[PDB]
Every structure is written in structure tokens, then in C-alpha cells.
Amino acid sequence: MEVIELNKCTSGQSWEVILKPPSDPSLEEIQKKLEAAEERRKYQEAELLKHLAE
Amino acid sequence: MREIVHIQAGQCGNQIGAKFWEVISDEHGIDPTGSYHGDSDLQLERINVYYNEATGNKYVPRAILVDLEPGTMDSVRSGPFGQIFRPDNFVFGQSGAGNNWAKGHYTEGAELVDSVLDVVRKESESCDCLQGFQLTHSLGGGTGSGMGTLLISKIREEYPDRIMNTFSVMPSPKVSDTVVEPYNATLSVHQLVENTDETYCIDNEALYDICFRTLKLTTPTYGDLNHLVSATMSGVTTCLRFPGQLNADLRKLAVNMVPFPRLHFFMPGFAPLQYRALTVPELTQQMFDSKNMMAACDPRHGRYLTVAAIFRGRMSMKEVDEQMLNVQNKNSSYFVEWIPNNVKTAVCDIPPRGLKMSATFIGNSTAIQELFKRISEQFTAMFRRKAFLHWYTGEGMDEMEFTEAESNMNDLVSEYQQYQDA
Amino acid sequence: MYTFVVRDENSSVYAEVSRLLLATGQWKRLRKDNPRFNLMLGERNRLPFGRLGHEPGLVQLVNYYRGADKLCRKASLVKLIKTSPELSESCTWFPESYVIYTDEREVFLAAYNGNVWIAKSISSEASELLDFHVIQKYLEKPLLLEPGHRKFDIRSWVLVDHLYNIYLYREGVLRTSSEPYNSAEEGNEMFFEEFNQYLMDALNTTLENSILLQIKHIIRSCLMCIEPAISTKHLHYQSFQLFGFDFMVDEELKVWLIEVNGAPACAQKLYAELCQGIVDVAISSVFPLASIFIKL
Amino acid sequence: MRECISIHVGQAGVQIGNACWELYCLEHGIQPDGQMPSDKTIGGGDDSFNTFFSETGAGKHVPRAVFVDLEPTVIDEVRTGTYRQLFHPEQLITGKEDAANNYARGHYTIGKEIIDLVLDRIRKLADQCTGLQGFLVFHSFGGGTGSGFTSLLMERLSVDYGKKSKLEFSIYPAPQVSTAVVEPYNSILTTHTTLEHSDCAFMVDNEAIYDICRRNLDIERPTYTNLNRLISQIVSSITASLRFDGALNVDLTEFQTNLVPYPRIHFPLATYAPVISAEKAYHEQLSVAEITNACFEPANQMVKCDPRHGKYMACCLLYRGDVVPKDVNAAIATIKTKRSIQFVDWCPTGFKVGINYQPPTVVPGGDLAKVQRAVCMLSNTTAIAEAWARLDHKFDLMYAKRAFVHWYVGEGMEEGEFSEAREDMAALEKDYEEVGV
Ligand SMILES: Nc1nc2c(ncn2[C@@H]2O[C@H](COP(=O)(O)OP(=O)(O)OP(=O)(O)O)[C@@H](O)[C@H]2O)c(=O)[nH]1
Ligand SMILES: Nc1nc2c(ncn2[C@@H]2O[C@H](COP(=O)(O)OP(=O)(O)O)[C@@H](O)[C@H]2O)c(=O)[nH]1
Ligand SMILES: Cc1cc2nc(/C=C/c3cccnc3)sc2cc1C
Ligand SMILES: [Ca+2]
Ligand SMILES: [Ca+2]
Ligand SMILES: [Mg+2]
Ligand SMILES: [Mg+2]
């Protein structure tokens, strides 16, 4: 049971005790994702208005 | 600010709508003249949901009154809270609909519908953030049924991204005006399936049974029937009108209650239906009892998709939570296992008038198919002989439209049976 | 009205337990996938312990101890005994065993130099075993019943409740051999009453003294050892489990531990009595309604 | 000195944000008006508390925080609350209507319209940083905003601040304090999109906080106020190293270094003790050994699971109050000989211990009693995967019937994102099992 790296300060202190040793998408791609979804809403809304128009 | 626009159409729609406004105006402390005289700031904290603030600190309902004859709306204007409604929001014709869906939807109603939409637009434009629309009507008549669904169709075109909910009164031979009610109802249901987010199915047969069997009223009037509807509507809208743990608009409430777009027809319930106050176990027991259901459908004949329960009054929230967890764990076979925790409960500190505490039930059960089956039987019984069809073809309708409406409701029924055996 | 589910149809024991619960009229059986349950008669393989104790307003109980497989596996039992300071190599009542695929191939051959062993998961030659799991020391001199000159083993059923009380069922059974032992009763099942009378007449001793004391010692030793690893004392759910301990006895009346079964079967005429006891102290103790065990 | 910016998203994030900043002010001796009599470096200085607080020429200590919600009713309570003078109006961002518990709504529909505004306000705080560490993000899993908008924000933060670390404080959905049903969807969806953007995430199951409040505080029906004040304590224990002088977890980087050896497995379990009722008159003060032993009691964990049936990859002990190193090590040696603490073979079986001499601060009039010593354990256990198992099971039950899916598709989201997110979670559970058993 070894105690290592004992650092002391006015606010407190810290150390490590060992018991045993071991044996992104770009800005463009995000904009493509968001606008693809916005377009799918517009399409589904258009099919609604088309249905109502009939 | 989460404003709700209220619309009421036809005889039934306006008489029920008036009672609703009569009740919630009392709860919020608004007198018939529109002046506030309550005793708590909690009555005004969410007053903007159903009321517009006038010039002289008055509160005018965000309500629009529609009919094809002036008879019923003259009665409203001459009623107790008749003067509280905005005069311009009285939109009426003279011809009437003659209990005919075609007249309400295609001929007579079409001549009046734009006039209503102008009032709707006027009310909507003055909303900080429109929450959604609310319609009270019957499905067995002509105006509320035919023009009501026509209005809904129009509103969805002008407001495609807004919630559209209805409080719909289902016809029944036990409480009937004309024989063509199943015709009008079938035609209306098809519209509601596609163009509403939530429809509270209020069965007049159920209302009659409750007044007769439970309330011990030998000869129930429409007034007695509307008393139950008024109390239920107050309970359903309680969490929206008062501060509480529940911070949700119509959309969020719709999201948690409707797993499938077409299957959005709810069974309302209320408890109690007396000086001796009820206990929380008693409230919960009655709330799930068929005798307190208003859709005239036996919940044991189906399964609950989702359930909402609203408790009003000062009570042990722990005891409420325990009692709700009691009913579910004693009847788990009636709740679908493929929707975890489908029973949600909200409490409100402010009770309704006359009761120290109450409970309102909102059930999305597959047993609601019994109502549509019942309507479908009555429909087919006449339609196989093309009986009384001349009333409709005389307004320009074809037999095919009837066949299509009949087929869409049978599809709805089959869809409900699909998830009952899941 | 309590609720329970059955997720192990092959369970011989809990098929009777579930039947007794229904006969009380205070227990309703649910669908196997219904989460709103009080009691769970779970499956043997991959029991979803992680989904237990997360139902508001429902005290949940399960008929299996999570992590008890460390005691009910061949390779795990050996590892548990050699590594635990409360057992260690000086175990006395457990045969010298070795784990081979850690592994202990070089250690086994060292002790190899009466030298007959048995591998499982019997030969005097070490090469015949490795070419064929754990290798255990085969008891070359077992106790034999007379008349018959036959080998036998003793099965004891042990119930451990949610409070980790250890209950030993009074009725055990002997799975005897029909053929005479060669080192070159109804259905072979003898119960305690007869076996006790035999010991008194033949060896002038009792079942309690010569054997049962050592048995109670071993059972209590194994379970109290693995207790801090499997205990559900402060868990969000509770566990109980029936165990099947298998024993051997030599000519010197010494008791040896063979294996431990997590899902054991019971004797025919003992089903009615044992299963009833399970309901009383392991189920009704948690879910009260409207002794055959020896507490260790 | 290096600064840390906190971001509070959705109702859960904002209200918990309020609880923490309230607690921070009490700890650092900052008055509600922003003044701080302790700070002698007026209008500047680079002390440890300056990591979370900026300073004006007037002497006001302003939190480096941003509050964002898609509806104003919750944040408006901050604008007129006790600490209204603490925040700048630009730090408080609100929208018209919320995401209605719909991930797709918060991420795609509404989030798109407000994402640029939020980033710009964050940029305002970033420009006042000499050397920004990274971000601390508070949000729920179940909410449409908390899940939907957060994942979108986390994506953009990696684009605009690639060198900066991002820590999460996430609220795991519990049915007992929720009225929503689609939370398993939102939880899985936001975890899948945020996973490769969060360096370290602390999950807090409301079920755990609920029972701790019921059991240890004698509260029958715990409110959000109850839950948040307790959550704030745990959060305070975790961020104390960033706000005080020390050598353990001094920056956001060391959190990943000391707790997260494997990137995807960045969900450390948190355990806290002691939780004592303020209405409890006579109370025997617990020792160092007693509160340390409690760290291995499942009933004190932020997520209910059984670490005994998993493996540890890392473990930190954060003590606050009257605590000496001698008693700590004396407790650790004893605990190992009574507890089943298994580490993975490729990690040292040890403990990184930190002590903050300043005793725990509690909100005056709160439900939590004042204690002389307290400890928060941060352990990376494979046992926390039980929470993923529960969550994914509820997902499977509903998605098999495609229940509620139409709400998400109607907001422009494709159905394929559901299965894509679920497959990621299936892989996540697999990773835990390989490391574990
Ligand atoms: N601990 C804690 N949890 C909360 C709090 N408020 C809400 N939650 C939880 O957060 C989950 C989702 O709700 P919200 O966070 O309010 O949703 P949102 O982020 O506002 O997103 P919207 O759906 O657009 O409103 C629920 O399961 C709640 O249990 C809170 O104050 N404290
Ligand atoms: N509950 C209730 N039902 C009504 C009332 N008035 C009419 N109904 C029902 O509504 C149907 C008649 O529709 P009605 O509203 O009178 O015709 P409309 O004016 O064209 O909409 C019948 O099935 C009646 O049973 C009422 O005041 N209360
Ligand atoms: C879960 C839940 C759902 C819910 N839905 C409600 C509906 C209100 C309403 C009012 C007017 C028009 N349309 C809908 S109240 C309610 C309460 C709970 C707990
Ligand atoms: Ca005309
Ligand atoms: Ca300073
Ligand atoms: Mg009429
Ligand atoms: Mg919100």
C-alpha cells in the first residue's frame, strides 16, 4: 500500500494510494443534416396542403 | 403565452360550451360582467390561457360562437354568463342545418365558414404564442358535425402547425333527435381521424346512464347531461388553467398520450359524480370504474395505451401516488406492456366548486372501438337500404362518399383491434 | 394480492412453488414479460438482474442470488477456495483440485508425483487426463453400504433467504449405486431415517454426529464466505436461492464436498414439503398472507 | 488561471444550474448582489474561484454561465429570483414554445432557429477568457430541449472549440418524477449524437436522488427543489477542485485522464455521503471510515447498480471538511478486506484521493444538515451499464410497435436514426461487457 504524489496546499491536500499494480462532423455536414430535416418537413407539409386542396 | 382559442358550433356545441365557460369563470373568479372578484392570485396566474384582458381590467373569453340558426346563440346571449362573450365573436346564419351533415359541410355551412375564420384569425393574431384550438360540438346533428369538421379542415390549412383538439358528443338511439345521426357521426369521425390531435369522446348514452343509474335522475334533461360534460371539461383543462407540477402545453400532452396518429380518441372520466368527502382510495377506484366512464365503453374489453389522471384539492400526494400504483399493479393485464409507465398523474391544489376534492380520468383505451362499432352497425342498418339518403344527395353528395366514410371507420376499428391483441 | 412471473418452465421445483402460490388465492401469475411483478422465478441463463428494483411502489424479489455462480461452477469453486483466506489451501473438507484449460498444469503434475484422479467440468495416469475442465482427487477409499458393497453420495437442499439466513432442509437423499464398487431401496434413493438406523446398527453412530455436523459446517463455510459478494441486504431488490450441495463420505466417516448446484431438483416425495417451506420462509416472509429447516 | 463556462439547457439544466450557482456563492462568500468582501483584487485577479466567476469594475462577481431554454417560464424565475443581479441578460436565453418532449423538435425543428444565437452569446463569454478550459453542460435526457438541443450544441461546440474539453451533467429519466413517456427515445437519441463529443459525463438518475431524499431526509414526496439541492451538493464536490487551490483535477483535462481510460466509456458512477436530515436534532457525526465505507453502499450512488458485479477502471475520493490523510488510508485498507472491489487487469488497483479542508456548505433553511466531513466518490464501474440496459429495454418495447415514432418523423427526423442510435447503444453495452466480465 504505497502513498505517492502528496501535494499540500492551504486549501487542502491530495495524493494517490496504490494497492496493486496492473497485470467529428464539419460545420457543413451538420448544416446538411439540419436542412435535410427542414426540407422533409416542407415536403410533408406540402403533401398536407395538396391533400387539403383536393 | 400559451393561449387557447375556443370554438363552439351547433346547438349541442354552444350549450355545452356555455356551461364550460360558466364553470371555469367561477373557478377563476370572473363574474358575468367580466370583472374579477376572486380571493387568490392563483386564479389569475394562468388566466390568459382562456381569457383576453380587456381595456378596463376585464376578462373576455377567447371563444368563438358558431351556428347556422340564431336560436341557440340567442339563448346563450340571454344566459347567466351571456354578456361575458365578445359580441363580434357571435357568428351565425339563419337557414339552419336541419340535422344534415351535408348542409353543414358543403352548402349552408360553406357560405358562413369564411366569416368564422376571420374571427378565428382575429383572435389568433393577438396571441403571443398560440397553443392550439379547442372545439365543442356534437356529431349527430348538422352544424356542429358538418360545419364543425369543415372549420377544422380550414383551420388545419391556415394553421398546419397548431394543435387541434375537440370535445365531441357521440349520438345514441337512447338520447336521439333524428334517425340520421349515425350518418352524420360516421361522416364526422372520418374528419376527426385525420384532422385532430385529441378527441374526447363524450357518449350521450353514457351520460344518460350516469344521470339515471348513478345520479338517480328519473328523467334526465340535456341540462343534466351537460352538467357532467361541464365538470369533465373543467377537470381536463385544470392543469392548463392552474399552476402546478405539470408544465406542459397541448402539444407535449398530446405527445405523451398519442402513440399512433389515428388512434387519438379518448375516454373521459370523472369522480365523484354530497357532504361526505371522498378518500383518495375511493377517488382512484371510482375514476377507473366503468360507471364513471363517459364513452359508454367497457375498459375490460380492451387495453389502455396511455392513461392520464388529474386530482384536484388538498390531499396526500404520497397516498395518491400509492393508490395509482395500486390500480395498475392489480390490473396490469389491461395496460399494454410495450409502453413502459403509460399512466401519468398530476395534482392541483384548487378544487372545483361544491367538492373538496375530485378526480378526472383521461383514457386512451382500445375499448373505444365499441363506440365506433356501435355507430357502424346503426349506419349500415340504414345504408344497406339507402334509407334517408335523399336528404344528403339533395345537397350534392354521392353514395360513394358514404361508402368511403363507412370503410374508413371500419379501418379505424380494425386498427384498434390490432393493438388489443399485441 | 401479490403478483409473480415464471421465466423458467424447465424448473422442476418452482413449477410446484408457483402452483402453491395460486392455491392461496392471494397470488396472481402474470405474463413472463410483465415488469410489474413482486416475485420473479427467473431463468438460469442471463437473468436480467439489472432491471430489478426499479418499479415504484413494488417490492421485488427473485429466486436467484446474483454472483452465486462462483459457488456453482466447477472452475469457479476451486478458484474461490484457493484464493479466499477463509478457505485457503488448508481446506480439509475439499478434494485437491486443479484448473486446466491459470492454468495449473505444472502445479498439478508436481503433486502427481494411491494416485487416482478424476477430470470433469477417472484414470491413474496423468497423460490420459490431459489428452482428454478441472481435475479433482478421486476418493479411492469411499464408504460403502452393506449389504451390497456400494458407493453413494449425499444431496442436501439449502435455502438462503433475503436476510441471508441459512436453512438446511431436514430431509436429504442418498444417490446410491446399484453395482458393487470396483477399484480396478427404491430407485437407488435412501432417505435419512433409514440411513440413520443403518449407521446405528452397523457403525454404532448417528447421522447427526458422524456426518451431518461436517455437512452443516461445509454449507455454512461456503455461504458465509461468498456472503459479502452476493448479499442483497441493502440492495434495491432482494434475493433468495435454493442450493443443492453434493457430498461424499469415506471409510473414516469424513465428509467431502463435491459440487454445488444453483438450480437443483428435489426428491419425489419431498417436493410437497420442501416447496411449501420455500413459500413460508423465503416468499411469505417478504410478502405476508392473511419447522422443516435447520437454521445454521 | 484557466476559465470554465457552464451551459444549462432545458428546465432540468436551468433549475439545477440555479441550485449550483446559489451554492457556489455561499461557498465562495459571494452575496446575491454579486459583491464579494473576501476578494481584495477588485475588478480582476486570477484566483481559483475566477474559473467560474468573472469580475467587473464595480466589483460584481459574475458567473461564467449561459442559460438556454426553448420556453421562458423556467428561466424567467431566474430573472426575478434571489440572484437576479448576478447574471447578465445576455446570459439568459429563452424561446417561444418548447420541444414538447420531442428530441427531433429540439434538435431539428426549433434548435436550428436558435443555435446560432446561443453560440454567439457563448462567444461573448469566451472572449473574456484568457485561456478557456472548456464547458460544463447541464441537461436532462428525457426532455425535448434537454436532449435535442443539447446534442446539437455539443456538435457545434466541437466545431467552434475543438481544443476545449466538454463535461456533462446528465439527468437519467425516472418515472416516479416524470409525466413523459417517450423519454427512453430522447435518452437514446441524445446519447448517440453526443457520445463522440463528451469527454466525461456524470449521470444522475432521479430515482436514486428521490429515494435518498425519502430515506435520509425523511421527505415523503420529494420535489424538484429537494432533488436539485442534493444534486448541487454532488456537483459542487466534483467542481470544487476547479474552484479551489489543489493538485487533483485542477482542469477539465484531468477528469478524462483520471476517470476515463476508454473514450466511449466516459460515464463515472458518483457516490455521496453523508446525507443527513436538517430536521434531525440529535445526530452522531460520522467518521472518515464510516463515510468512506458508505461510498460502496449502492443506496448512496447517483445511479442504482451493483459495482460488485462489475470492474473498476478508475476511482477518485473527494473529501471535504475535517479529514486527515491518515484516517483515509486507514479506511481504504479496511474496506478492501470487506468489500468486493475488482479492477481490470490493465489498470492499477488504487485510489486518487483529494481533500478540501473547507467543510460542506448547505443552503440555509434547506433539508440538508450541516456536516463536519463529507466525501464524493467518482468510480468508473462497468456496473453503470445496468442503467443503459434498463433504458434500452424500454426503447425496444416501444420501438417494436413504432409507438410515438410519428411525432419524431413529423419533425423532419428519419426513422433510420432510431435504429442507428439503438445500434450504438447495443455496441456500448457490448463494450462494458468486454471490459467487465
Ligand atoms: N433533477 C431534476 N430533474 C428535472 C428537473 N426538471 C425536470 N427534470 C427531469 O427532466 C426530464 C425532462 O424534462 P425537462 O428537462 O424539463 O424537458 P426540457 O429540457 O425542458 O425540454 P422540453 O420538452 O422542450 O420542455 C424529466 O424526466 C424530469 O424528471 C429538475 O428541476 N431537477
Ligand atoms: N349532451 C348533449 N347532447 C346534445 C345537446 N343538444 C343536442 N345534443 C345531441 O346532439 C345531436 C343533435 O345535434 P345538434 O347539436 O342539436 O345539431 P346542430 O345544431 O346542427 O349541431 C343529438 O344526437 C343530440 O343527442 C346537449 O345540450 N347536450
Ligand atoms: C399526462 C397528462 C395528459 C393530459 N392531457 C390533458 C389534456 C388537456 C386538454 C385541455 C383542453 C383541450 N385539449 C386537451 S390534461 C393532462 C394531464 C396529464 C397528467
Ligand atoms: Ca344562403
Ligand atoms: Ca478579484
Ligand atoms: Mg338540435
Ligand atoms: Mg421545458
Provide the sign of the torsion angle of the four alpha carbons D118, D124, D125, D126, taken in this order. Answer: positive
Of B59, B5, B54, B3, the residue nearest B27 (C-alpha): B59
Task: Tell whether C50 and C70 lie within a shared domain.
Answer: no
Measured between alpha carbons, how far is C78 from C70 in angstroms, rounded to an integer? 9
Helix (H) or strand (E) holding C57: none
**Can you tell me the distance from the alpha carbon of D54 to that of D45, in angstroms, rounded to the nearest whole number?**
10
Q: Which residues contact A54 (CB under 8 A, 6 or more apart)?
A: none
Task: Note whether D176 contacts C56, CB cutoff 8 Å.
Answer: yes
Q: Per CATH, which fold does B260-367 belong to?
A: 60s Ribosomal Protein L30; Chain: A; (3.30.1330)
How far does the centroid of ligand 7 lie from the alpha carbon of residue D204, in Å? 18
**Parallel, antiparallel, or unpaired for β D165-172 and C117-120?**
unpaired
Which atom of ligand 1 is nearest the CA belonging to D9?
19
**Grid cell locating B125:** 393574431
C15 and C76 co-located in one domain: no
How far apart, in whole angstroms, are the C-alpha atoms of residue A31 and residue B106? 46
Spatial separation of the C-alpha atoms in residues D74 and D177, rounded to whole Å: 17
If asked whether residues C86 and C18 sit together in one domain, one would say no
Q: Which atom of ligand 2 is nearest to the CA of B145?
A: 21
May I ask the CATH architecture of the domain B368-422? Orthogonal Bundle (1.10)
Cell of B356: 373538496
Are the beta carbons of B340 and C36 closer than 8 angstroms?
Answer: no
Rounded CA separation C79/C75 (Å): 6
Which of C 210-229 lie inside 8 A of D, CB atoms?
Answer: 228-229
- Whether residue C5 is found in the same domain as residue C79: no
Residue whose C-alpha is closest to residue D7's, from D144, D123, D173, D127: D123
List the beta strands (DSSP E) in chain C: 2-6, 27-29, 39-41, 61-62, 97-99, 117-120, 134-137, 154-160, 166-169, 173-175, 189-190, 238-239, 241-249, 255-261, 293-295
Q: D351: which strand partners?
A: A17
Q: Specify whether C53 is located in the same domain as C155.
A: no
Does residue C41 sit in the same domain as residue C152?
A: no
Q: Which residue of A has its CA nearest to D162?
A: A24
Q: Residue with C-alpha cell 340567442? A: B74
* Strand B265-271 relative to strand C255-261, pairing: unpaired
d(CA B175, CA C282): 58
Residues with CB under 6 A from ligand 2: B 10-12, 15-16, 97, 99, 138, 140-145, 169, 171, 175-177, 181, 204, 207, 222, 225-226, 229
Q: Give the C-alpha separation, B255 to A35, whole Å.
A: 24
Question: Measured between beta carbons, which residues in chain C are less than 8 angstroms from residue D216?
Answer: none
| Gap between the Cα atoms of D437 and D435, Å rounded | 6
Say whether both C2 and C76 belong to one domain.
no
The CA distance from C8 to C41, in Å, is: 7
Query: CA torsion angle for C88, C90, C93, C99 (degrees, to 10)?
Result: 60
**Among B8, B65, B108, B177, which is best to mutate for testing ligand 2, by the most ligand atoms less than 8 A from CB?**
B177
Tell me the C-alpha distance between C51 and C35, whole Å.
9
d(CA C228, CA B166): 59
Which residues have a beta carbon within 5 Å of ligand 7, which is an ion? D 11, 98
Do residue B338 and residue D403 have CB atoms under 8 angstroms apart?
yes
Which residue in D332, D329, D334, D317 sits closest to D374, CA to CA?
Answer: D317
Ligand 1 centroid – CA D223 distance (Å): 12
- Can you tell me the distance from the alpha carbon of D273 to that of D375, in angstroms, rounded to the nearest whole number? 6
Question: Residue D143: CA atoms inside 13 Å, Cβ hemisphere, count?
Answer: 24
Three-state DSSP at C271 gives: helix
Annotate chain D with three-state secondary structure.
Answer: CCCEEEEEEHHHHHHHHHHHHHHHHHHCCCCCCCCCCCCCCCCCCCCHHHHCEEECCCCCEEECEEEEECCCCCCHHHHCCCCCCCCCHHHEEECCCCCCCCHHHHHHHCHHHHHHHHHHHHHHHHCCCCCCCEEEEEEECCCHHHHHHHHHHHHHHHHHCCCCEEEEEEEECCHHHCCCCCHHHHHHHHHHHHHHHCCEEEEEEHHHHHHHHHHHCCCCCCCHHHHHHHHHHHHHHHHHHHHCCCCCCCCHHHHHHHHCCCCCCCCCEEEEECCCECCCCCCCCCCHHHHHHHHHCHHHECCCCCHHHCCEEEEEEEEEECCCHHHHHHHHHHHHCCCCCCECCCCCEEEEEEEECCCCCCCCCCCECCCCEEEEEEEEEHHHHHHHHHHHHHHHHHHCCCCCHHHHHCCCCCCHHHHHHHHHHHHHHHHHHHHCC
How many whole angstroms separate alpha carbon D64 and alpha carbon D135?
10
3-state per-residue secondary structure call for chain B: CCEEEEEEEHHHHHHHHHHHHHHHHHHCCECCCCEECCCCHHHCCCHHHCEEECCCCEEEECEEEEECCCHHHHHHHCCCCHHHCCHHHEEECCCCCCCCHHHHHCCCHHHCHHHHHHHHHHHHHCCCCEEEEEEEEECCCCHHHHHHHHHHHHHHHHCCCCEEEEEEEECECCECCCCCHHHHHHHHHHHHHHHCCEEEEEEHHHHHHHHHHHCCCCCCCHHHHHHHHHHHHHHHCHHHHCCCCCCCCHHHHHHHHCCCCCCCEEEEEEECCCCCCCCHHHHHHHHHCHHHECCCCCHHHCCEEEEEEEEECCCCHHHHHHHHHHHHHHCHHHECCCCCCCEEEEEECCCCCCCCCEEEEEEEEHHHHHHHHHHHHHHHHHHCCCCCCHHHHCCCCCHHHHHHHHHHHHHHHHHHHHHHCC
Nearest-angstrom CA–CA distance, B15 and B10: 8
Contact C2/C28 with Cβ under 8 angstroms? yes
Protein residue with its CA nearest to atom 23 in ligand 1: D101
Q: CA of A50, closest CA in chain D: separation in Å?
A: 16
Residue nearest to atom 2 of ligand 3 (CA): B308
**Nearest residue, CB atoms, C54 vs list D207, D338, D385:** D207
- Asked if residues B383 and B410 have their Cβ atoms less than 8 Å apart, the reply is no
Contact D60, D35 (CB under 8 A): yes
Q: Which superfamily does CATH assign the domain made up of B1-259 to?
A: Tubulin/FtsZ, GTPase domain (3.40.50.1440)
Scan for cell 359524480, then name that residue: B273
Distance D236 CA to ligand 1 centre (A): 20
**What is the spatial distance between Cα D312 and Cα D341, in angstroms, rounded to a whole number?**
7
Domains of chain D: 1-268 (3.40.50.1440), 269-383 (3.30.1330.20), 384-437 (1.10.287.600)
CB neighbour list of residue D268: distance below 8 Å, 6 or more residues apart: D200, D202, D259, D260, D314, D378, D379, D380, D384
**D195 CB contacts (<8 Å, ≥6 apart)?**
D264, D424, D428
The Cα B146–Cα B155 span in angstroms is: 14
Which CATH number fits the domain that encloses residue C49?
3.40.50.11480
Same domain, C47 and C69: no
Q: C55 and C146, same structural domain?
A: no
Q: Give the CA angle between residues D203, D209, D211 to the nearest 5°.
A: 140
Nearest to B188 by CA among B97, B252, B250: B97
Backbone torsions φ then ψ of D91, nearest 5 degrees: -80, -15
Q: What are phi and psi of D20, to 5 degrees?
A: -70, -45
d(CA D145, CA D111) in angstroms, rounded, equals 8
Residues in B touching A48 (Cβ below 8 Å): 156, 160
Full residue range of the structural domain in which residue C85 is found: 64-95+141-296
**Chain A residues contacting B via beta carbons under 8 Å:** 45, 48-49, 52
The residue type of D122 is I
Name all chains with 3 or more CB-CB pairs below 8 Å to chain D: A, B, C
Strand partners, D368: D277
For C263-272, b/e burial (b = at least 16 CB within 10 A) is bbebbeebbe
The answer to whether D193 and D150 are in contact (CB under 8 A) is: no
Rounded to the nearest 5 degrees, what angle is found at the Cα of B129, between the Cα atoms of D90 and B267?
A: 130
Amino acid in the structure at residue A16? E
Give the residue carrying C-alpha cell 413504432: D402
Distance CA D257, CA D316 (A): 12
Q: How far is C51 from chain D (nearest CA, A)?
A: 6
Give the Cβ contact number of residue C111 at 10 Å.
12
Residue C238 Cα distances to C49, C62, C104, C220, D300, angstroms:
10, 7, 37, 20, 17
DSSP alpha helix (H) spans, C113-212? 127-130, 192-202, 207
Q: Please name the residues in contact with D365: beta carbons below 8 A apart, sequence gap of 6 or more.
A: none
Residue B11 alpha carbon to ligand 2 centre in Å:
6
C-alpha cell at D130: 484568457
| Residue C30 touches chain B, beta carbons under 8 Å | yes
CA distances from C24 to C12, C288, C289 (A): 20, 12, 9
CATH number of the domain to which C161 belongs: 3.30.470.20
User: Closest approach of chain D CAs to the CA of B107, in angstroms?
Assistant: 34
| C vs A contact (3+ beta-carbon pairs below 8 A) | no
Q: Are residues C277 and C229 in the same domain?
A: yes
Asked if D318 contacts D354 with a C-beta cutoff of 8 angstroms, the reply is yes
* Nearest atom (ligand 3) to Cα of B250: 14
CB B97 within 8 A of CB B106: no
Q: How far is D384 from chain B (nearest CA, A)?
A: 21
Is there a catalytic annotation at residue D254?
Answer: yes
The position carrying cell 384536484 is B312
DSSP H or E stretch at residue C74:
helix C74-83
> Which residues 6+ apart lie within 8 Å of C102 measured at CB?
none
Handedness of CA C94, C100, C104, C110 (dihedral sign): positive
Task: Say yes or no: C146 and C16 in one domain.
Answer: no
Q: Is the previous residue joined to D199 through a cis bond, with omega within 30 degrees of 0?
A: no
Residue C101's Cβ-count burial label (10 Å; 0-12, 13-18, 19+) is exposed
Are the beta carbons of B108 and B95 closer than 8 angstroms?
yes
Which of B307, B332, B343, B345 to mutate: most C Cβ within 10 Å? Answer: B332
Residue with cell 345504408: B383
How far apart are the CA of B161 and the nearest CA of chain A, in angstroms?
A: 9
Give the closest residue (by CA) to ligand 2 atom 16. Answer: B11
Facing B337 at nearest CB: one of C1, C33, C56: C33
Which H or E run contains C17?
Answer: helix C14-23
**Other C-beta atoms lying within 10 Å of the C-beta of residue B38:** 15
Angle at which helix D224-243 crosses helix D10-27, to 10 degrees, equals 60
Contact between B207 and B232 under an 8 Å Cβ cutoff? The reply is no
The residue whose CA has the least distance to atom 29 of ligand 1 is D178
φ/ψ (deg, to 5) at C41: -95, 75
Q: In Å, what resolution does this model reach?
A: 2.6
Establish whether the linkage from the previous residue to C288 is cis, with ω within 30° of 0.
no
- Interface probe, candidates B264, B325, B336, B338, chain D, greatest D C-beta count within 10 A: B338
Number of other residues whose CB lies within 10 A of the CB of residue D174: 21
State which ligand 1 atom lies nearest to the alpha carbon of D146. Answer: 19
Q: Which residues line ligand 1 (CB under 6 A)?
A: D 10-12, 15-16, 70, 98-101, 106, 140, 142-146, 171, 173, 177-178, 180, 183, 206, 224, 227-228, 231
**CA–CA distance, B192 with C216 (Å, rounded to integer):** 72
In whole angstroms, how far apart are CA B166 and each of B132, B195, B264, B348, D188? 11, 10, 11, 23, 33
Q: Is B317 on the interface with D (CB under 8 A)?
A: yes
C-alpha dist (Å) from residue B174 to B179, B228, B374, D19, D341? 11, 17, 13, 59, 72
Pick the residue from chain C with its C-alpha nearest to D387: C50
In the set D254, D386, D411, D417, the catalytic residue is D254
Of chain B residues 340-379, which have a CB less than 8 A from chain C? Answer: 340
Nearest 5°: the CA angle D245, D249, D252 is 110
Give the burial class of B176: count Cβ atoms within 10 A of its Cβ; 0-12 exposed, 13-18 middle, 19 or more buried. middle
Q: Indicate which of A41, A42, A52, A54 best probes the interface with B, i.e. most B CBs within 10 Å of its own CB.
A: A52
D356 is in an annotated binding site: no
C-alpha to C-alpha distance for B115 and B113, rounded to whole angstroms:
5
Question: Do both C20 and C156 map to the same domain?
Answer: no
